[PDB]
Amino acid sequence: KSLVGVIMGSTSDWETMKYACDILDELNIPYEKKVVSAHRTPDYMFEYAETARERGLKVIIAGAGGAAHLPGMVAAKTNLPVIGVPVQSKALNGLDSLLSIVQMPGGVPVATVAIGKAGSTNAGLLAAQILGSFHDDIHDALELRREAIEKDVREGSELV
Amino acid sequence: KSLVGVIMGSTSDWETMKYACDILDELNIPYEKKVVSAHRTPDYMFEYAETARERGLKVIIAGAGGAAHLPGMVAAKTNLPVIGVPVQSKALNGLDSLLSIVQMPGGVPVATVAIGKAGSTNAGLLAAQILGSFHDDIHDALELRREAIEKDVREGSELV
């Protein structure tokens, strides 16, 4: 049973959103991934969000660029934590994506991460952290993962 | 036993961070509030972050402005979810705060919310949502709060 839903407005955002999914896979967290568009499939977006809780999801990761409304509108329709990944847009390099996602009004939080693939990775990790707040096995896995990277960086980053 | 830690670098940030605490008070979620500075008390910041999980905290809300490093450095030191509130800075109106918080690299997510008061309110709600991913009573209270606001706004839609 999926614990995290990873959604995005278009297939073109997949190369960004796959980073989140890779993290979930690495950590063996069950998830689903779907294209759900705020602007092209608005009714479907509402159905997806409003039924997430009953479907067993605990966290939603939503990616969008430009006038990026997907994370906020999903957030307006569920009280699951919603993590917003600003996709890097062509003209404004994700500045529009960022402001469109992060500047939510009081009452409807969206947990916003960095523009692009770094943010996407981080959305997966943040979802895992949210689960880890109550599943010690996931928290332990996150700790070990971080420890392993710390060692790799401190001990195996030779400069020539 | 506090479930949320609400921290900020300066007593002057309280004007912003109070809003997150008002939400927690409203939802009867036990929390602690402290002045922890990334730049003025860096050792204390590491100790606070390191010991949060042991102490029973499940989420940390951190507010900072300007070259805002508090949320990110706390996040580097704990696998609890960390919510970053960008405080509105004087010269750049929180643009510096926002970018210095949200643009975290892969491996160390910070759940970033809006600049200022709206963001602070939302950090409290987001922490509650994170708790609500395990605690059905908190999730239900969030749903009820939102439903009452919906009614106040909808059965109040007339501009007279």
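Chain B touches chain A at residues 19, 53, 58-59, 79-81, 83, 98, 102-115, 117-118, 121-123, 125-126, 129-134, 139, 142-143, 146, 149 (CB under 8 Å).
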